[PDB]
């Protein structure tokens, strides 16, 4: 019965679940953790990654 109200709640929840999961997606880099890149790389080349 109350389906139109759960629609806007599930959409905002799904929007925040897909946004938080994009942090685990390597956008062509060596990894997804920033601290791992900054530590295991020299400053000049770490900028590109």
């Amino acid at each position: 019965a109350l389906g139109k109200l759960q629609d806007v709640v599930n959409h905002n929840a799904q929007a925040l679940n897909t946004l938080v999961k994009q942090l685990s997606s390597k956008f062509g880099a060596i990894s997804s953790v920033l601290n791992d890149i900054f530590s295991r790389l020299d400053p000049p080349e770490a900028e590109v990654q």
């Binding site: 601290n35 791992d36 900054f38 530590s39 295991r40």
Partner: protein, 49 residues
């Protein structure tokens, strides 16, 4: 021992690292400190900063 350096013997040693989520066995010469729990501080456990 007559040619220039284009064909001279070159001793090559390649070190293949893994760097994955596993119990680390080969660390570096970095020392250790005392563990402080109830404080927001900078931690570095086996490279994970």
């Amino acid at each position: 021992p007559t040619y220039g350096v284009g064909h001279q013997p070159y001793r090559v040693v390649v070190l293949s690292f893994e760097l994955l989520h596993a119990p680390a066995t080969v660390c570096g010469p970095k020392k250790s400190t005392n563990l402080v729990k109830n404080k927001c501080v900078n931690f570095n456990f086996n490279g994970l900063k």
